[PDB]
Amino acid sequence: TETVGKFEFSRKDLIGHGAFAVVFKGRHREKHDLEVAVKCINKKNLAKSQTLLGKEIKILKELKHENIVALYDFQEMANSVYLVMEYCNGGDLADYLHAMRTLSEDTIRLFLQQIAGAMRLLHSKGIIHRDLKPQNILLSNPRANPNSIRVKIADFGFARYLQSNMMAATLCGSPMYMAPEVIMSQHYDGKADLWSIGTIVYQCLTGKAPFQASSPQDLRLFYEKNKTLVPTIPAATSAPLRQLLLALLQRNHKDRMDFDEFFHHPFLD
Ligand SMILES: CCC(=O)Nc1cccc(Oc2nc(Nc3ccc(N4CCN(C)CC4)cc3OC)ncc2Cl)c1
Ligand SMILES: [Mg+2]
């Protein structure tokens, strides 16, 4: 039993062991029914793990939202960092998709409405996530309201503030979810995240990536050679969902849907 402020956990109660964090279940030390997740350095990748967890503290201490995993406390030192976070008892979207194979439009809509709510806060704060993918979208059952299941965006280790007249250029994220401009080593902005979201939505709908390749390098070459990208959308797809996907999965960020359009899109009614 280790303690971090008013919280405790045991390293028996593993949640998961990523390359840049190890996460354990724990609880408040007074209020034992308040569950938490405690994120720790992965010493196999100490320097990078420490950097990412420090960056996550900097971003998350500024974000309170129902659809973003909450940072309850943290403890940063020269050689160790801990985050104490809201426990998401439903696990990740990736595991859910692995079981469901595909999601109905109504479920996509429920989840996407919540993601958009989170993204509205990020966009208003000038923050880009840069690693949106099903492994970083968590589910929580916190319930006498309709559709009480909650989506929570996690893993802000790669996120940054981006001033509204500036472009980012750091290469980070997961190749299969990365916007073309990102993986082609160009300058990008907040619309890179909208591509990632479009690819998650497409994956939920069809069970596949919109643009398949054998490796990151292959996917890059594919985007380089194809000046327009058109995802294959099933004929059964509703017209608002088809239009949303086509507007999100535009190769060129200038042509891609922007935030205001995304938040007010007919599909999300
Ligand atoms: C390798 C999986 C992992 O550790 N992934 C992850 C990714 C992002 C954040 C995170 O931390 C948290 N995880 C949870 N919950 C949670 C997260 C992941 C799972 N998995 C993921 C897939 N595995 C195959 C099974 C369990 C189970 C979980 O509960 C039940 N709740 C709060 C935080 Cl801060 C953990
Ligand atoms: Mg961009």
From Swiss-Prot:
Protein localization: Cytoplasm, Cytosol; Preautophagosomal structure
N6-acetyllysine modification, residue list: 152
Post-translational modification summary for this protein: Autophosphorylated. Phosphorylated under nutrient-rich conditions; dephosphorylated during starvation or following treatment with rapamycin. Under nutrient sufficiency, phosphorylated by MTOR/mTOR, disrupting the interaction with AMPK and preventing activation of ULK1. In response to nutrient limitation, phosphorylated and activated by AMPK, leading to activate autophagy. Ubiquitinated via 'Lys-63'-linkage by a complex composed of AMBRA1 and TRAF6 following autophagy induction, promoting ULK1 stability and kinase activity. Deubiquitinated by USP20; leading to ULK1 stability and autophagy initiation.
Domain Protein kinase: 9-268
Top-level taxon: Eukaryota
Active site: 131
Expressed in which tissues: Ubiquitously expressed. Detected in the following adult tissues: skeletal muscle, heart, pancreas, brain, placenta, liver, kidney, and lung.
Record: residues binding ATP: 15-23, 39
Stated consequence of mutating residue 39 to I: Abolished serine/threonine-protein kinase activity
Quaternary structure and partners: Interacts with GABARAP and GABARAPL2. Interacts (via C-terminus) with ATG13. Part of a complex consisting of ATG13, ATG101, ULK1 and RB1CC1. Associates with the mammalian target of rapamycin complex 1 (mTORC1) through an interaction with RPTOR; the association depends on nutrient conditions and is reduced during starvation. Interacts with FEZ1; SCOC interferes with FEZ1-binding. Interacts with TBC1D14. Interacts (phosphorylated form) with TRIM5. Interacts with TRIM21 and IRF3, in the presence of TRIM21.
Task performed by this protein: Serine/threonine-protein kinase involved in autophagy in response to starvation. Acts upstream of phosphatidylinositol 3-kinase PIK3C3 to regulate the formation of autophagophores, the precursors of autophagosomes. Part of regulatory feedback loops in autophagy: acts both as a downstream effector and negative regulator of mammalian target of rapamycin complex 1 (mTORC1) via interaction with RPTOR. Activated via phosphorylation by AMPK and also acts as a regulator of AMPK by mediating phosphorylation of AMPK subunits PRKAA1, PRKAB2 and PRKAG1, leading to negatively regulate AMPK activity.
Entry's family note: Belongs to the protein kinase superfamily. Ser/Thr protein kinase family. APG1/unc-51/ULK1 subfamily.
UniProt-recorded name of the protein: Serine/threonine-protein kinase ULK1
The species this protein was found in: Homo sapiens
Segment of the intact protein contained: 8 to 279 of 1050
